Amino acid sequence: WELTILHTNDVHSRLEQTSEDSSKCVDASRCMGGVARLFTKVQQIRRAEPNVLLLDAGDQYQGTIWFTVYKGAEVAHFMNALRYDAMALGNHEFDNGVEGLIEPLLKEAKFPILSANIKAKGPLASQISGLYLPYKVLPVGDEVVGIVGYTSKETPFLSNPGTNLVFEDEITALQPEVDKLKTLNVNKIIALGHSGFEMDKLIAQKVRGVDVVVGGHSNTFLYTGNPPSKEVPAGKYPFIVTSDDGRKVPVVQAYAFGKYLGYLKIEFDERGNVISSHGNPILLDSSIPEDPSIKADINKWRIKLDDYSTQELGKTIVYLDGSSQSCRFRECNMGNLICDAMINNNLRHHVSMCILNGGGIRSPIDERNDGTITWENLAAVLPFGGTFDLVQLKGSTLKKAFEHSVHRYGQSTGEFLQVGGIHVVYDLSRKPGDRVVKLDVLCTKCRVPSYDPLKMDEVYKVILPNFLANGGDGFQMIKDELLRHDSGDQDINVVSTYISKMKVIYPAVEGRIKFS
Amino acid sequence: WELTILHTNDVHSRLEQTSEDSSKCVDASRCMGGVARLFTKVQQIRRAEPNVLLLDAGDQYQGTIWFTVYKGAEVAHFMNALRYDAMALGNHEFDNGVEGLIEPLLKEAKFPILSANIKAKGPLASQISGLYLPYKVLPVGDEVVGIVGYTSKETPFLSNPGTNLVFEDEITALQPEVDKLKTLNVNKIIALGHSGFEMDKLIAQKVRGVDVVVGGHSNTFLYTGNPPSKEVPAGKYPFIVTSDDGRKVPVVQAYAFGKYLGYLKIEFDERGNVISSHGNPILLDSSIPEDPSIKADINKWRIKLDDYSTQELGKTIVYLDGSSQSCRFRECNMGNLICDAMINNNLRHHVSMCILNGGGIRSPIDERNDGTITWENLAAVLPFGGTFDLVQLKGSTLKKAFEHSVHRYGQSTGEFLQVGGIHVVYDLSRKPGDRVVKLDVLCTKCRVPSYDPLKMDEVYKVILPNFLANGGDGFQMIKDELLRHDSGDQDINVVSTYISKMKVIYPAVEGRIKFS
């Protein structure tokens, strides 16, 4: 029995074709992605493949202005237009709250949204009951296929799902549902969830009954061949997990931002045992044309958004590297911009130091043609919308924060820190906690202001975002050890006023972060 | 026969008491200098010493707004008020031109102005004839003392004396005049000039007849004891030059900016042979009170100047080190300010590089109380009033300019270069031309903007002042090798607009310049 699984994940409201760095498209001839382009390939596959399922493995919220304006409707309207079959809940579908998901998406969505490890209790459970399900049986061909959904068990520590929700462990919540499914004689079972390729490998091996594992949340790219763009692949597509019951479970994931459409052809038998499965992510590039019906429908909406973009801000002469591939591994100039901007707005209401988690930086801004910046640009960088809080810290506290900046370096980890007024040097041939080999911090009260070796028993004032000030990302030493805490100024607003003040900005890799 | 020589040099219109760094006074209790304070000590000495001469060895022009407003009158009126006996011409007395000296100073001055190596020829010689003399015989006590004047033989390459003047070699022009003096039976002979302690040591030994050598132009500080302030002394006061005719000629010089009054008691005999001479510069500090008659007369004028100062510009939170002691030896933050400001004003009309001769930086700005900056401040930094010209240069050309930046490092040399967008590392345990051990220059067209090793056969665009663009200070390779030259914007004006744009600036020693 043939079954073709089309799957997306981590679109982040990039329903509009984007530059290769998944940021606002500048030259359509090179641009790729978008719901419109995705439509023409799904449509094409459905033309030739009688048995098909289209599934998104979470994270359609946030990313671009398309969300912070329609705050959900854009996802529901165009996921329905693309006629998705199922979707597992992601962590970003709670960034606007439990009500910021129930009213816009769950109610207006024409298809099931799945998650098995999310238990609802209290006054809220009354109605959200049945607005999402732990699974769903889908009739394909003359057979049936069962999807079981899961979400990250760290969403209440990554998003805003309120307190009337509980996020259980995925495996311990999926297996009871999967047993239920096979006692209903639904052998063909797909696991679709938002926990991360590493946790998806835990489910594939340690859940009996699962036939496929489709997932996301870590923006992982798998390929069997020669990759088509700048994303270097982790493993082959599908990756094969040798489960504990003696089975070859395919693990699949297609990068992010709607740049690739996952495609997995699966051959079953009567008892629903996966004989084999070949596939590969499909780069939705310029060769695949936008579908006019969708493309125009997109511009029916873009008209509303144009008001935020058509307003001028300032100019940039160099490319602003806000890419996760550089802002979580080395000194990216986007962070240096944000940190230099940070220490300008406070100077009107005596600090010189700045730390910033590269994970907060969510989009690059491609300097092009005239090198002009807009709110649509700055918004894609900082979708969270917080403030830059002033914090009094011990030197010992800052020392360990930078040991936390590289404590698990190498896994695209978002807690890697950008700097301003700080010179840090790492040596990764040392065990976590000995990696910082030099740290010279800029002093101001000194008569010769300059970078000097950090003293452990000294008081420094650093400006960092609210999310760090409260010990996010695992910086619990900051939240607990700080000597004072002051309120900040809206994050995107002040960076907008800064670059408007400058009128031209050229941040560079100045050697703030170095490696030994 | 007793004769007390009081001498000043390199006041640079600092007739107003100044902070210890010779910049605008902030707390009078600590402030020192000024014509008023100088008056009460000269007056005191004349009360007790029957035979005295007061002489300035050049450089009363420029330095502060007092000049760029009254452009000479302030010097004439208060040098007369201090009742100077003679003065040798300095190089800065031509910064406003030959007419910018004849009308304000030479005509209105009630005393002789001396220089022997300045020959006047052409249409100008007609009147400037006799407005200054090569020497003068002064009656002191019941005897006579002869002063011979000299100026730097590099003034037409340091100032603007026009083309109708000629600056001869000092020695070859002094000795003929000194012979004339001793054939007139004026044995007591003082040499007063503006060429530099090193050239004054040439005159003392190689001019027969000279009894004393009083000079300046290098702002040298000599002391016999324990110095009273931050200036570390070169030698003892007086320094003794063992002349070629077998004589102990005293070489004297008192720092600068009116901070010390030189004081040299000299014992002669009938034939006018210097038996001995003891003395020491007198720190005109707060203990010596301002003379009310002068102090008030100073405020009679300050009223006119207040208009430039009482206008706001911006703020600074850190001390701006514009001191020659740091801006000609290492990375001073005043230069980094000027270079960062330089690459902001051009960005409105694509460069990132900046070189700047520390000699152009002529005053620090002391961040105090509220850390507010004014035109009176910015003017004292850049008395020259030029522009910041854009220049296209080869990489090989920039390489040798930095070898010229330290080619004779160690002598308070003004051709030492400040940077912006450049990382230079020197190693002075190498012969001039091998001292640059590393140079990484910031690139912008590169997709990862950052500092990269300078390529010799590559084209870079640096912004530097007009004085450098025309190969000043010995940078003749720049003037000759550049590939293009563009006009600049007024130097002080744009730095004012910058810091006004910033509203707070905190330049620091970031490690642009380093030493191995």
Ligand SMILES: Cn1c(=O)n([C@@H]2O[C@H](COP(=O)(O)CP(=O)(O)O)[C@@H](O)[C@H]2O)cc/c1=N\OCc1ccc(Cl)cc1
């Ligand atoms: C600011 N912030 C953040 O920078 N992060 C960064 O994202 C990283 C995770 O990103 P990822 O690895 O790409 C997975 P994704 O979050 O895109 O699903 C973390 O490491 C951290 O650096 C996470 C949460 C977070 N804030 O969470 C609270 C919050 C959520 C939504 C809204 Cl509208 C307002 C406040």
Ligand SMILES: Cn1c(=O)n([C@@H]2O[C@H](COP(=O)(O)CP(=O)(O)O)[C@@H](O)[C@H]2O)cc/c1=N\OCc1ccc(Cl)cc1
């Ligand atoms: C700009 N400039 C300069 O920076 N310098 C710097 O001064 C240094 C000499 O200073 P110093 O050793 O302290 C003796 P002083 O000139 O104070 O008598 C040089 O090395 C050089 O870096 C010299 C000449 C110079 N410009 O000379 C042309 C000029 C003169 C007056 C006016 Cl109003 C306009 C244009």
Ligand SMILES: [Ca+2]
């Ligand atoms: Ca099965």
Ligand SMILES: [Ca+2]
């Ligand atoms: Ca004699």
Ligand SMILES: [Zn+2]
């Ligand atoms: Zn994501």
Ligand SMILES: [Zn+2]
């Ligand atoms: Zn996610």
Ligand SMILES: [Zn+2]
């Ligand atoms: Zn001088």
Ligand SMILES: [Zn+2]
């Ligand atoms: Zn001079």
